[PDB]
Design a protein around this ligand. Structure first.
Ligand SMILES: [Zn+2]
Lengths: 186, 91, 565, 437, 188
């Protein structure tokens, strides 16, 4: 339970303190992005490694679990530098690690950060995914909500307020969504 | 205080205005260089590197030998005009 | 004139007094380009005089040809001039048209000391000196490591007695002193000490010591380790004391974006370890190639075999060293203790200096000097082309100079990127020389000549040629136990139709007692004095010469016929 | 229990480290670092214009050091080895080794422009000229501290069997003169706190078992010392033995208490350096260890003030959270009048005997007299407002200038005290007659 | 005649020049008290009567000129300390419209002293550099709220620094002028 708070605290203190010479480059970037209504941050791996190698080690071992924690840390900083409401911010990464040729990817690489290159050959249309979502309970007519995030979920079955075996339905009239797209790399 | 694009009335106008500027710059108030720099003086001493081979030249403070890609440690109040003319860089 | 360590302060006081006036540029520095130690020294001096508000000019110089030109044009109110990194071996009063009577201001009636309107100061550890410079030449003022006073009694005596002397007794005496001086002259070159080191002692004397100065000291010193290992080894302990002295209290505190540190820790004779990859660090190391014969597959397979036994997966050994896994990074210091012995490769382990500033990551002095050197080499009818080339090489001085500043790390990274390509191109020529067996094994010395190559232009610069020579010398030093021989290396140019020639010494292996001396100087000199051939001698390092295409073979024929080799 | 140890003015222990300060004064300070079996020493100056900072190596492990603006003196307490170094190059340094009995050790050393002095645990005193020629040997109480300023020298001595004591002397080249010889010293001891508290500062008491934090002569040659209670003491009227007396002139703890808003910031410590007229030069040290470290932090300046206040009363008077406590005007005026009086007397004694150094100090004395009457007028007016004619009249005697007495008449008129107007004018007439005489 | 970028405003160089004329407290390492300085735009007595390690007050440009060399040390202003900056941040958070009462030159002086005099502070410099940033960010929030009250008549500002005003000058004055033109045109 406490580990989720220590990790968030660590990335929060990263953004608030990384100077190179005399400019707090991530505080300035995060402020300048909000003014043009861009809710994201472009972190660079080499700076993270320079600041504290342990954080990069945690990120390198379990990326599916740790990327959401760093994203919520960005939101917590974004409020302090601009409010005396905002969505959850998108984390974006840059790296210079060795490229893997696309033909060499195999079972040794599952759930690892990978850098590669190629040619885009196809693009899908946009489609909608849910982030904040509201729920109605069919029997008692009680209501609640859930927060999805898009890393590797289904509707729950613990009924509340007997209340039945599978009583939950979605209120699309009070829920939030985001864009998603598919691509093919050759 | 080159000419082909100016109309002839403009060609004499420019000469007239140059005469006026040098008249103001001369006489009383001569102690302040009205055509000099407008940026406040930051430092007395600077390091300047030699960009063009103008050879040996004279200036009110003294004589310089502009050996290409040599470097000077000198007071700015002297070399300000040579920086403006483009023989020197501040590095 | 010469001064001792106990009297450097006095020259400094004299200079401050003599170059006082603000009306004129009363102080001039002449510095040899294409030398690192000279560069660093000059840097140090510049900072000192900066603090002292001494108006001055810095001029880089290529060689003797340029030296005369630059000296010629000097104004009379130039009360003081410094010669950095050259000149100790030659009579300066002979080299220039010096009449002392054109420069004495005042003769001190009491001392007999003549005060001159233009004073010339010299810094160089090349030996032996031209004796007049020490003894006769009053305007000339050079610094010595007590070497002159300690050694030269018979020679000093010989010089003065020979000068004073100007029938059986007279004949015997003259013959005697002729002998003495003849014995002293014409001995192989050697270079005994670091320029920057001497200046650091002066800074010590004044009280100007700081980490910015000490790091320059280390940098300058470090440049010697490749070629004059003995020197480096003599100097080294002093550096440890200084680093331990000036490092602050409360050590091993938490980082800050402002925290700077300098510390002693392991370093490896591996080519740029903390950049590129671990595998490339071994593969391009100048020492490893001599120890495992990497020019052929029976050598390369030994390297693969080593990493397999060390327990490092070969696909991770090729990853960029910054991104390589943390566990391997911290276990590497123990893995080498268990495995290098089986490959006869234990000499890889040593201690060195590492510096870091804030959050931007560590670098060692050994890596820094390679970056500097690379920037020197590759930074961006016949007489005009020569002129253009020589002028281009001087701009790289400033492209190097500006990289000594912590505010300009951007330029240093470019230097490192160039260093990697230079070593790659050197290795790809060395393998061709060995596999085609272009080394000719003459009885007295080893000869090698490059008639063609993938791009032979890279060897037109002296420094690059020296790097290739240094590669071949390690290979020749380890390939057989027998026959430590001199080596000659040459490269043609299609624009001049001239061969650029270098004469190279042997050397003893790293792990093993007087030093040897480079004798090519006298040899080259004597054949040049004799020969019909069209040749050039103007370089500070006399071991390097140039000659036209058709004249190489008669020159080398006369050279091998000579007994001076 | 007590044990003898070496000392030098305001040194530091090694602590956990391989380096320390040997001593400090107004001119500069000395530091050293240990390098396996050898030591490196560094000498620093605040007058960077006048002097050059320098360094050298010691193989012998000196543990004693003394500085003046002519040179530096170094010693080894166990081996008896000593060395003196002039600041100039011209007079080359010289060394000597001094005899010692079994278990005897040197406790302190000091030097004038022409005299060299050494003291030991067994109470032996030895003296030499600036070229090591011996002059005399004497047997006294064991010495624990020494200091000098030109020809004036100030010494401290302690024994189980003779108590704590001090001496004052002047090594005039015309003649040597003693003003006090091992007379009793009223200094506050630290032993009770060291025996009871177990504060983990025991290393400092091992390093300095006397707990005498520092001692030096003023900028006008007055003898001064800083106690283990963190109080500054000065010896007044030393020229007159029936009038000589010790004066407490500043309590550091009381200042930090007020500065903190009446709070107990025991994490803060004061390290004294030198006394410049009315102002202390000092380092403000924070954290575990009550002494400074490297690189040297910048100094601070602080004025002396008389001990008159009370914490509880000032808290009651006072009653943003750290705001320094507000004080009654009566206390402020009283403290000023006492401080003005003491300062004027000390300055007067200095001028009476040694004259002006610079040609303007009389003007400061005039300013002090003005401040003195001004403070008394405020106190007088308070007494008049209270209608205490007796106390107001007693205060009026202490005013100097008739300007102030005229103001006192106006104050009495505002107080509507014609009796006091009358009696002040009687005093003014009497003092005018005394001025006419 | 005059450059286009100097028609209505001061450049940051001129702002630095203006700030440099203020007095500052120093400790000299040499004694000048018994040539003499003979200045014409300032007092001359203080520099002629210096005594080593005796505190004195001089103009800032001469103070930086001395600190260039060994001869001087600069005392930091009392507001430039961790305790005071903590209190000012708390004031800023407590009063969501008022500006805290920092001196008119706080940004300029902080960014001069951190470069020229990094060695003479008592607090650790890497904390001061953080607290200065916190103050500037909070003040920028308060500025962005205020630009919704540009009007035809006037505005009041308090404790806003010189550099902060100069940053905003060409925007506020221009938009306010055009609102004035639109309004008065309807009256006429
Ligand atoms: Zn329910």
């Amino acid at each position: 339970d406490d580990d989720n708070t220590e990790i968030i605290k660590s990335f929060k203190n990263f953004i608030l303190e990384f100077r190179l010479d005399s400019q707090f480059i991530y505080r300035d970037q995060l402020r300048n992005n909000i003014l043009v209504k861009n809710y994201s941050l472009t972190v660079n791996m080499e700076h993270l490694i320079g600041y504290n190698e342990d954080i990069y080690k945690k990120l390198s071992d379990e990326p599916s679990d740790i990327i959401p924690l760093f994203e919520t840390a960005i939101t917590q900083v974004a409020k302090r530098i601009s409010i005396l409401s905002l969505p959850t911010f998108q984390l974006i990464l840059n790296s210079n690690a060795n490229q893997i040729p696309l033909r060499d990817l195999d079972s040794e690489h599952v759930s690892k950060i990978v850098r590669l290159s190629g040619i885009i050959i196809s693009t899908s249309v946009l489609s909608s995914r849910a982030t904040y979502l509201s729920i109605m309970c069919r029997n008692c007519r009680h209501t609640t909500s859930i927060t999805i995030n898009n890393f590797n979920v289904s509707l729950p079955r613990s009924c509340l307020s007997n209340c039945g075996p599978d009583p939950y339905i979605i209120i699309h009239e009070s829920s939030k969504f985001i864009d998603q797209q598919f691509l093919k790399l050759q | 205080n080159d000419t082909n694009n100016l109309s002839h009335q403009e060609q004499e106008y420019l000469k007239e205005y140059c005469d006026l500027i040098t008249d103001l710059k001369s006489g009383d108030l001569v102690d302040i260089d009205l055509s000099g720099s407008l940026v406040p003086p930051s430092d007395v001493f600077i390091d300047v590197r030699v960009l063009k081979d103008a050879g040996e030249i004279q200036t009110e403070y003294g004589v310089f030998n502009l050996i290409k890609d040599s470097q000077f440690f000198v007071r700015q109040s002297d070399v300000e005009r040579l920086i403006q003319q483009g023989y020197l860089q501040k590095i | 004139m010469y001064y001792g360590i106990s009297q450097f302060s006095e020259a400094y006081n004299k200079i401050l007094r003599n170059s006082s006036s603000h009306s004129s540029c009363q102080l001039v520095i002449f510095v040899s380009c294409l030398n690192i130690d000279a560069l660093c020294a000059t840097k140090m001096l510049s900072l000192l005089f900066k603090k002292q508000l001494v108006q001055s000019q810095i001029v880089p110089i290529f060689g003797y040809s340029e030296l005369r030109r630059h000296y010629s044009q000097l104004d009379d109110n130039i009360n003081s001039l410094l010669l950095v990194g050259f000149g100790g071996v030659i009579d300066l009063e002979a080299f220039l048209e010096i009449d002392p009577q054109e420069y004495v201001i005042d003769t001190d009636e009491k001392s007999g000391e003549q005060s001159f309107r233009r004073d010339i100061y010299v810094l160089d550890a090349h030996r032996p000196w031209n004796l007049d410079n020490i003894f006769g030449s009053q305007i000339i003022q050079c610094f010595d490591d007590g070497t002159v006073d300690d050694t030269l009694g018979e020679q000093k005596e010989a010089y003065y007695k020979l000068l004073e002397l100007d029938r059986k007794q007279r004949k015997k005496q003259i013959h005697e002193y002729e002998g003495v001086l003849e014995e002293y002259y014409s001995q192989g070159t050697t270079v005994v000490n670091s320029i920057s080191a001497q200046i650091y002692s002066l800074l010590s004397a004044i009280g100007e010591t700081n980490l910015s100065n000490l790091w320059l000291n280390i940098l300058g010193t470090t440049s010697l380790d490749i070629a004059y290992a003995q020197v480096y080894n003599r100097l080294y302990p002093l550096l440890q004391d200084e680093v331990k002295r000036l490092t602050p209290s409360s050590r091993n505190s938490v980082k800050t974006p402002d925290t700077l540190t300098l510390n002693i820790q392991p370093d490896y004779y591996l080519f740029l370890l903390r950049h590129s990859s671990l595998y490339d660090s071994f593969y391009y190391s100048n020492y490893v190639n001599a120890k495992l014969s990497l020019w052929n597959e029976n050598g390369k397979k030994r390297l693969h075999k080593m990493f397999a036994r060390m327990g490092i997966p070969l696909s991770t050994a090729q990853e960029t060293w910054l991104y390589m896994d943390h566990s391997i990074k911290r276990e590497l210091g123990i893995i080498f203790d268990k495995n290098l012995d089986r490959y006869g490769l234990q000499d890889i382990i040593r201690d060195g200096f590492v510096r870091t500033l804030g959050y931007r990551g560590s670098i060692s002095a050994s890596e820094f000097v390679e970056a500097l050197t690379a920037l020197l080499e590759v930074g961006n009818n016949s007489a005009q082309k020569l002129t253009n080339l020589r002028k281009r090489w001087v701009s790289n001085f400033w492209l190097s100079w500006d990289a000594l500043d912590d505010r300009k790390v951007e330029l240093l990274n470019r230097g490192i990127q160039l260093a990697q390509d230079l070593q790659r191109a050197i290795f790809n020529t060395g393998v061709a020389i060995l596999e085609k067996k272009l080394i000719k094994h003459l009885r007295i010395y080893r000869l090698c000549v490059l008639q063609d190559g993938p791009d032979l232009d890279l060897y037109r610069n002296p420094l690059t040629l020296l790097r290739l020579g240094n590669w071949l010398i390690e290979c020749c030093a380890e390939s057989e136990d027998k026959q430590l021989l001199p080596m000659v290396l040459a490269s043609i140019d299609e624009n001049t139709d001239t061969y650029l020639v270098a004469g190279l010494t042997p050397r003893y292996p790293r792990g093993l007692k007087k030093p040897i001396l480079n004798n090519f100087s006298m040899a080259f000199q004597q054949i040049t004095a004799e020969t019909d051939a069209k040749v050039r001698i103007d370089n500070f390092e006399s071991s390097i010469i140039e000659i036209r295409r058709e004249d190489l073979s008669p020159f080398l024929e006369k050279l091998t016929l000579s007994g001076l080799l | 229990k007590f044990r003898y140890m070496p000392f030098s003015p305001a040194g530091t222990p090694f602590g956990f480290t391989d380096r320390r300060y040997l001593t400090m004064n107004e001119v500069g300070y000395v530091s050293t670092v240990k390098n396996s079996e050898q030591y490196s020493i560094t000498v620093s100056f605040f007058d960077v214009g006048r002097f050059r900072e320098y360094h050298f190596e010691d193989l012998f492990g000196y543990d004693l050091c003394f500085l003046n603006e002519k040179g530096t003196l170094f010693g080894q307490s166990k081996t008896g080895q000593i060395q003196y170094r002039p600041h100039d190059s011209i007079h080359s340094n010289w060394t000597k080794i001094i005899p010692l009995q079994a278990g005897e050790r040197i406790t302190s050393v000091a030097a004038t422009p022409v005299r060299v002095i050494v003291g030991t645990s067994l109470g032996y005193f030895r003296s030499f000229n600036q070229f090591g020629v011996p002059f005399a040997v004497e047997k006294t109480s064991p010495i624990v501290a020494l200091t000098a300023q030109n020809y004036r020298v100030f010494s401290v001595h302690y024994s189980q069997f003779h108590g704590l004591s001090y001496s004052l002397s002047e090594l005039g080249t015309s003649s040597k003169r003693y003003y006090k010889r091992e007379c009793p010293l009223p200094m506050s001891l630290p032993n009770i706190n060291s025996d009871m508290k177990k504060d983990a500062n025991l290393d400092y008491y091992n390093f300095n078992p006397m707990g005498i934090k520092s001692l030096f002569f003023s900028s006008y040659g007055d003898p001064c010392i800083f106690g283990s209670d963190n109080t500054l003491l000065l010896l007044s009227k030393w020229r007159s033995p029936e009038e000589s007396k010790w004066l407490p002139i500043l309590d550091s703890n009381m200042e930090i208490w007020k500065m903190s808003g009446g709070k107990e910031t025991t994490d803060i410590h004061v390290w004294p350096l030198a006394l410049a007229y009315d102002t202390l030069n000092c380092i403000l040290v924070k954290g575990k260890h009550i002494w400074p470290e490297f690189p040297l932090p910048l100094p601070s300046e602080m004025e002396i003030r008389m001990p008159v206040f009370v914490k509880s009363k000032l808290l009651e008077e006072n009653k943003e959270e750290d705001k320094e406590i507000q004080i009654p005007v009566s206390m402020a005026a009283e403290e000023e009048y006492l401080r003005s009086k003491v300062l004027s007397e000390l300055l007067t004694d200095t001028l009476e005997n040694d004259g002006e150094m610079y040609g303007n100090e009389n003007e400061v004395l005039a300013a002090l007299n003005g401040a003195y009457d001004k403070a008394l007028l405020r106190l007088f007016a308070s007494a008049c407002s209270d209608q205490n004619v007796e106390k107001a009249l007693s205060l009026a005697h202490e005013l100097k200038q008739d300007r102030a007495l005229t103001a006192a008449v106006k104050i009495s008129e505002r107080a509507e005290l014609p009796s006091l107007v009358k009696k002040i004018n009687n005093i003014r007439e009497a003092r005018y007659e005394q001025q006419l005489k | 005649s005059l450059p286009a970028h100097l028609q209505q405003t001061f450049s940051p160089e001129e702002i630095q020049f203006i700030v440099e004329n203020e007095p500052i407290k120093i400790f000299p390492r040499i004694t000048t008290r018994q040539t003499r300085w003979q200045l014409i735009t300032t007092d001359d007595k203080a520099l002629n009567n210096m005594v080593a390690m005796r505190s004195t007050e001089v103009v800032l440009w001469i103070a930086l000129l001395l600190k260039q060399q060994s001869k001087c040390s600069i005392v930091a202003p009392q507001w430039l300390t961790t305790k005071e900056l903590d209190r000012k941040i708390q004031y800023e958070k407590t009063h969501p419209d008022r500006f805290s009462e920092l001196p008119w030159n706080w940004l300029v002086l902080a960014r001069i002293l951190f470069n020229k005099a990094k060695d003479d502070f008592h607090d650790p410099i890497h904390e001061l550099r953080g607290k200065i940033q916190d103050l500037r960010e909070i003040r920028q929030i308060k500025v962005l709220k205020g630009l919704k009250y540009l009007n035809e008549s006037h505005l009041q500002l308090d404790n806003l620094s010189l550099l902060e005003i100069n940053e905003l000058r060409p925007f506020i004055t221009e938009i306010m002028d055009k609102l004035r033109e639109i309004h008065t045109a309807s009256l006429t």
